[PDB]
Design a binder for this molecule. Structure first.
Ligand SMILES: *[C@@H]1O[C@H](CO)[C@@H](O)[C@H](O)[C@H]1NC(C)=O
Ligand SMILES: *[C@@H]1O[C@H](CO)[C@@H](O)[C@H](O)[C@H]1NC(C)=O
Ligand SMILES: *[C@@H]1O[C@H](CO)[C@@H](O)[C@H](O)[C@H]1NC(C)=O
Ligand SMILES: *[C@@H]1O[C@H](CO)[C@@H](O)[C@H](O)[C@H]1NC(C)=O
Ligand SMILES: [Ca+2]
Ligand SMILES: [Ca+2]
Ligand SMILES: [Ca+2]
Lengths: 100, 368, 238, 122, 100
């Protein structure tokens, strides 16, 4: 037999967004691989949040962040008013198949 | 054939005397801010506004009965990259303030207030997931769009004709007086007029923009052209409104948005939604115009809901069918968006179930 | 006199189905009436009615004396009309002192909570650019800039209750008329009462404010020609 | 000692003339319904009420400026096992309604309203 | 090595409450065992919900219904005005151990 065993990951805050116009947070799976953070090739769903505000969700922030299961998280300074971002992080879900 | 008549949304004309004898039915005026930059006033004086401040969108400048404010905020590298970010209806001389943000959050007197809410004759509710209706008894109605981005529409009972001030102009059926400032002279251009209506003295004055963002990227060029050209195509769904509303300003808006917008699809679909909504305000039911375009707004609906092109009433609710509702007594232009399908209702939990699964409510008691 | 309260407690408990509920309700009623008269009964639930301590929502704790406002983070950001009401001090579950509840409802200290400007979330310990001004969310309070020389003197929002029209709502040659809107006070140099600013750090009387027409600025006593007629700038008018 | 005074929350009394010279500070009256059956009026006339209806708890009876309503419902096998189940502040001649239920849900004109809310001076 | 394996159980609607003054819905663990429903002696949480209305939590119903994870769900007609109960059911969380 073979059954899927799946679990969440921990929190990954690999950058601190920079003040200015081009600044922000760019937490990408390729950057995660380069920095040595373990990146699962296959996944089901991922969760992004603000690291300094661990309660209020993303939509309650109202800031322009794009966060997707294929790429990761991106917040650009120039797209928000004031032209800044918060310090975000994210976590992923890894599932393997274990013999029964 | 003489003897016949035909009534528009705004006037009725009879074929007689060898001519058209035209009388006018009263028409509620309509201001709007679309794309976060473009403004169509009550006199239909379309103009562009690239500003970063809070601007008095409209105000009955005899008194302080109502004051619709709009906060336009710069959204990118370029000074001409703006998004609407809030709509702050001040009221009773500032005693009340209903602030609709861009995420959909509604703040009653700077306090979060979910929807609907009915108090002091003010009714707030969402006909669909794309729009928020702030209906007041003072005369003005606000209809605010959140999806795909933030746009505002304002309706006035024609009684206030030739009385208002603010960005949307004095509503007196004259396009040459729209730039009347508080100093008694007609201002020259858009930004020069707007910089007299800023809320805060510390804001930076808006600047006139000649450089078309369309000239920057050739791929942005071809994308915006190939999509925004769907407006003026005589075989397109939009053709039905061409013989009523000239689509040239809307095509210019679509071009400018998509070329300048970092999220090209968002601003593109905002422009197409704006054209559709304006035409439906004039009384044409444009339908099925999202062929191969803007379908990610079909799919992203909340679960158990579904899209609808003609949403022309309140939202069918179990509480409402049980005990009536003040909400459904407001007439607004038929907007599109996500709603429960017919024959279904959303309970207090919000999930969409048929009538058989939702309970009657007596004295507020859930009666299964 | 506690005799009617004792009769109430007897009747309730002997009749109540969850007689603990009605017992604790009667004791709470006596406590609240006494607090209404002006007595502060505390620590009265010794070995009794403690299931009302334990059932508290997470991050909250019981409190015997809630004598005023519930401390909210939004309020410390931008004041609160809710929180100026005098009510007899009641008991119940509340966030512990020095801590505030964020919009999520959880309880965090002041350092973990954002300052709200225009209703926009702004994480603590962050400096942002807004309206040519430099602001910061320090520990939940928003403090912004951008000790003077010319007649205009500094105004600080630390002493004033949250919501006063600060330096941003400065009486000016333009905003004297429209009336300024701002939910966040900002500290800055502001002309003394009776004058306004020129926008460049000066102070000018309200009857000499320059008139602005078509991106230009005209001092009073200047004339312009519009179409076929000529206007003159007087008292911020043409 | 002579010259001393002591003020209750409702009155202040000075020890003089060999007596207490007492004046009355303003006192907001306080009605209450406790236990679901017992009522302490504004005049402090405690009395029990075992009812199954909605009762006009208090109302400025010259006009209809406000009308605080209480619905008291039977809660048990016996007819004297009652619970308060709602408090319906009717306002402006019934034009406005704030209904606080028993589980904490507050309804403004029969529409669920989370707390706090601040409108129409309410 | 041994790992925890928890799992919800399905809905156990074991009674239809009776109209009247003494009727109601008494979903009790021992009664469930007597009726044949498998009830785990060891549990962590249970969940109650009105059988006919599966969307609104018990609290929004506002009726005097008491569920305890050790003993079960009770609703008596008299406690509620109107002198009737709704139709309820519950589910149990059964957890055991599986070798690694
Ligand atoms: C508009 O004209 C049509 C066609 O004559 C007619 O049916 C309709 O009633 C008219 N609308 C009115 C009278 O409001
Ligand atoms: C509507 O406005 C009037 C006038 O301000 C006010 O007296 C009334 O309470 C409001 N609400 C209703 C339901 O009439
Ligand atoms: C009440 O009496 C005390 C003791 O004399 C005094 O200090 C206080 O001011 C009095 N309260 C008043 C006058 O409101
Ligand atoms: C308070 O009551 C007055 C008196 O009717 C009313 O005019 C006003 O709208 C209410 N609200 C506020 C915020 O003043
Ligand atoms: Ca980061
Ligand atoms: Ca006009
Ligand atoms: Ca049952």
């Amino acid at each position: 037999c073979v059954r899927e065993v799946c679990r969440w990951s921990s929190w990954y805050n690999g950058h601190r967004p920079e003040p200015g116009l081009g600044g922000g947070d760019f937490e990408t799976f390729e950057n995660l691989r380069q920095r040595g953070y373990q990146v699962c090739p296959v996944l089901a769903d991922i969760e992004c949040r603000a690291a300094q505000l661990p309660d209020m969700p993303l939509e309650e922030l109202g800031q322009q962040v794009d966060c997707d299961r294929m790429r990761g998280l991106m917040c650009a300074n120039s797209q928000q008013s004031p032209p800044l971002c918060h310090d975000y992080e994210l976590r992923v879900l890894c599932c393997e198949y274990v013999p029964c | 054939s003489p003897g016949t008549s035909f009534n528009t949304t705004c006037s009725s004309c009879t074929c007689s005397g060898g001519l058209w004898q035209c009388q006018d039915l009263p028409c509620p005026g309509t201001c709007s801010v679309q794309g976060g930059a473009h403004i169509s006033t009550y006199d239909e004086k379309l103009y562009d506004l690239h500003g970063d401040c809070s601007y008095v969108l409209s105000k009955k400048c005899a008194d302080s009965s109502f004051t619709v404010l709009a906060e336009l905020r710069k959204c990118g590298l370029t000074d001409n990259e703006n998004c609407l970010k809030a709509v702050t209806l001040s009221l009773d001389g500032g005693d009340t303030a209903i602030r609709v943000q861009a995420d959909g959050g509604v703040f009653l007197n700077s306090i979060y207030t979910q929807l609907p809410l009915s108090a002091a004759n003010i009714t707030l509710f969402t006909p669909s997931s794309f729009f928020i209706v702030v209906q007041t008894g003072l005369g003005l109605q606000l209809l605010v769009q959140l999806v795909p981005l933030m746009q505002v529409f304002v309706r006035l009972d024609p009684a206030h004709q030739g009385q208002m001030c603010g960005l949307c102009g004095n509503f007196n059926q004259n396009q040459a007086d729209d730039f009347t400032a508080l100093s008694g002279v007609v201002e020259a251009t858009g930004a020069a007029f707007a910089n007299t209506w800023k809320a805060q003295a510390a804001c930076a004055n808006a600047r006139n923009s000649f450089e078309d963002p369309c000239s920057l990227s050739v791929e942005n060029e071809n994308y915006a052209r190939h999509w925004c050209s769907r407006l003026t195509d005589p075989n397109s769904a939009f053709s039905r409104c061409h013989s009523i509303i000239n689509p040239k300003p809307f095509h210019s808006n679509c071009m400018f948005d998509t070329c300048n917008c970092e999220r090209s699809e968002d601003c593109l679909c905002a422009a197409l939604s704006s054209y559709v909504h304006a035409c439906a305000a004039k009384g044409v039911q444009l339908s099925d115009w999202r062929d191969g375009v803007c379908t990610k707004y079909m799919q992203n609906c909340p679960k158990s809901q579904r899209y609808a092109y003609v949403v022309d009433a309140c939202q069918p609710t179990c509480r409402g069918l049980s005990e009536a509702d003040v909400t459904c007594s407001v007439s607004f232009v038929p907007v599109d968006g996500c709603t429960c399908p017919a024959g279904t209702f959303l309970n207090d939990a919000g999930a969409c179930v048929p009538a058989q699964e939702c309970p009657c409510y007596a004295h507020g008691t859930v009666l299964a | 006199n506690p005799k009617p309260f004792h009769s109430n407690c007897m009747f309730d408990t002997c009749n109540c189905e969850r007689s603990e509920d009605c017992l604790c309700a009667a004791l709470s009623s006596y406590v609240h009436a006494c607090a209404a008269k002006g007595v502060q009964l505390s620590d009265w639930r010794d070995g009794v009615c403690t299931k009302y301590m334990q059932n508290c929502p997470k991050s909250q704790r019981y409190a015997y004396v809630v004598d005023a406002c519930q401390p909210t983070c939004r309020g410390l950001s931008e004041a609160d009309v809710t929180c100026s009401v005098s009510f007899v001090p009641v008991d119940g579950c509340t966030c512990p002192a020095g801590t505030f509840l964020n919009d999520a409802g959880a309880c965090v200290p002041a350092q973990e909570c954002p300052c709200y400007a225009h209703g926009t979330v702004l994480a603590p310990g962050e400096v942002v650019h807004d309206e040519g001004a430099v602001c910061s969310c320090t520990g939940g309070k928003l403090s912004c800039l951008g000790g003077c020389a010319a007649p205009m003197v500094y105004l600080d929002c630390s002493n004033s209750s949250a919501g006063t029209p600060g330096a941003e709502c400065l009486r000016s040659c333009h905003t004297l008329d429209v009336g300024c809107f701002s939910t966040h006070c900002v500290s800055g140099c502001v002309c003394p009462p009776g004058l306004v600013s020129d926008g460049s750090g000066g102070c000018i009387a309200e009857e000499d404010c320059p008139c602005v027409h078509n991106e230009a600025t005209y001092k009073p006593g200047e004339t312009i020609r519009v179409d076929c007629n000529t206007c003159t700038c007087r008292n911020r008018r043409w």
